[PDB]
A paper describes a structure:
The adenylate cyclase (CyaA) toxin is a major virulence factor produced by Bordetella pertussis, the causative agent of whooping cough, and is involved in the early stages of respiratory tract colonization. Once secreted by B. pertussis, CyaA invades eukaryotic cells through an original molecular mechanism that involves a direct translocation of its N‐terminal adenyl cyclase catalytic (AC) domain across the plasma membrane. We have previously shown that a peptide, corresponding to the C‐terminus of the translocation region TR of CyaA, P454 (residues 454–484), exhibits membrane‐active properties related to antimicrobial peptides (AMPs): this peptide adopts a helical conformation upon membrane interaction and induces a local destabilization of the lipid bilayer. Here, we show that P454 is able to translocate across a lipid bilayer and binds with high affinity to calcium‐loaded calmodulin (holo‐CaM).
Initial attempts to crystallize the P454:CaM complex were unsuccessful. However, we obtained two distinct crystal forms of CaM in complex with a slightly shorter peptide, P458, corresponding to the residues 458–481 of CyaA (i.e., shorter than P454 by 4 residues (ASAH) at N‐terminus and 3 residues (MTQ) at C‐terminus), and that displays an affinity for CaM similar to that of P454 (K d CaM = 240 nm). In both cases, several copies of CaM and P458 were present in the asymmetric unit. The superposition of these multiple copies yields an ensemble of P458:CaM conformations (Supporting Infromation), which illustrates the well‐documented conformational plasticity of CaM due to its central helix flexibility. The structure of the P454:CaM complex presented above reveals several residues of P454 that might be critical for the interaction with CaM, including the aromatic residue W458, the arginine residues R461 (R1) and R474 (R2), the aliphatic residues L463, L475, I479 and L481, and finally the histidine residue H477. Our data shows that the affinity of the P454‐derived peptides for CaM is mainly altered by mutations of arginine and aliphatic residues with a progressive decrease with the single point mutations L475A, R474Q, H477S, L463A and I479A or with the reduction of the side chain apolarity of the I479 residue (i.e., I479L, I479V, and I479A). These results confirm the contribution of these residues in the complex formation as suggested from the observation of the peptide:CaM crystal structure. Substitutions of aliphatic and histidine residues at the C‐terminus of P454 (H477S‐I479A and L475A‐H477S‐I479A) resulted in ≈20‐fold decrease of affinity of P454 for CaM, while the mutation of the N‐terminal aromatic and aliphatic residues (W458A‐L463A) results in only a 4‐fold decrease in P454:CaM affinity. These observations are in agreement with the crystal structure of P458:CaM, showing that the residue H477, and more importantly I479, from the C‐terminal part of P454 are crucial for P454:CaM interactions.
Numbering used by the authors:
A (entry chain c), E (entry chain a): 458 to 481
B (entry chain C): 5 to 75, 81 to 146
C (entry chain N): 459 to 481
D (entry chain A): 6 to 75, 81 to 148
F (entry chain Q): 458 to 478
Write the structure that this text describes.
């Protein structure tokens, strides 16, 4: 599946878990 | 790392049921059985032989620390959650195609279907959470 | 690599369990 | 519903015999595989907390209700943030530094009081388990 | 302790995971 | 008291992970 796609999806989630934690 | 060897001795003790210093093939079997898996003696042997640096059949604490150093299991759950948009627990070729296109991947329908049937073990047409970590390893 | 993953699968669940039961 | 399938796989770890209910000694054998060795008394009040009917055992519907209470490793991540030297203990000095980073204008007494709020063993620092106890406290 | 500190601490790790995952 | 139960449960997820992959 290739490293760039696996780590990119993880980076998106990371941005997500960031905005969510920043909510509180 | 110096205070980390603590947390690995607590993890190792969990498998070394007798406390002899090594995790025998049957001690891994008992921990695996407590986790619902009932693997064969053959499957347990090739599992130890992979992280058996000396090939003596058992894993002493130093081999265990070396194995633990290698690597990211809970971050995989996050990546799967990213690919599976509809939250149905299965990654469709459509879900994968959109996630690839979002990330700038110029992958054709065949490249996407090949990624699907590549992680497709039971032939569910979809990349299950299990099927996903099986290829992620 | 099938039985192998199915192990790490159930653990993820056992900790979500002993979390709620335990707390 | 997919969630129920995952919870049926989860209940099976506790329900070794498969009778439909989690007895006290079944909670004990699983706890013991994780090294924890609680008394029969401790297992009983642990079940009694999630025993709606009080039958002594936890059935699948009761178990489902408990899982619906409510990511469980978010605390592992937060602790790793607070515990700077990675020694596994949050000193009052480390907490003070982390609060200042987030802009908390907390005095030395306020920081020591936070340490004492989460220090169960009284070693002066908050280990992981003490942190998890404070994070997962209703 | 304050939800302010607990969620801030999770947001730091997420920014971290973010940078580390962005690195691929 | 019991959160040490999920600590060990947490560690077992990692140990299992690399004991085969
Ligand atoms: Ca042994
Ligand atoms: Ca050895
Ligand atoms: Ca039972
Ligand atoms: Ca009941
Ligand atoms: Ca420290
Ligand atoms: Ca302490």
């Amino acid at each position: 599946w290739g490293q760039r796609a696996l780590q990119g999806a993880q980076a998106v989630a990371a941005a997500q878990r960031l905005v969510h934690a920043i909510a509180l | 790392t110096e205070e980390q060897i603590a947390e690995f001795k607590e993890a190792f003790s969990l498998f070394d049921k007798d406390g002899d210093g090594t995790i025998t093939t049957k001690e891994l079997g008992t921990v695996m059985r407590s986790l619902g898996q009932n693997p064969t003696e053959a499957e347990l042997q090739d599992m130890i032989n992979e992280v058996d640096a000396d090939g003596n059949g058992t894993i002493d604490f130093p081999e265990f620390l070396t194995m633990m150093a290698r690597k990211s299991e809970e971050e995989i759950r996050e990546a799967f959650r990213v690919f599976d948009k509809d939250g149905n627990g299965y990654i469709s070729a459509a879900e994968l195609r959109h996630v690839m296109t979002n990330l700038g991947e110029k992958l054709t329908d065949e490249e996407v279907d090949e990624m699907i049937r590549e992680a497709d073990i039971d032939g569910d047409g979809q990349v299950n959470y299990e099927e996903f970590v099986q290829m992620m390893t």
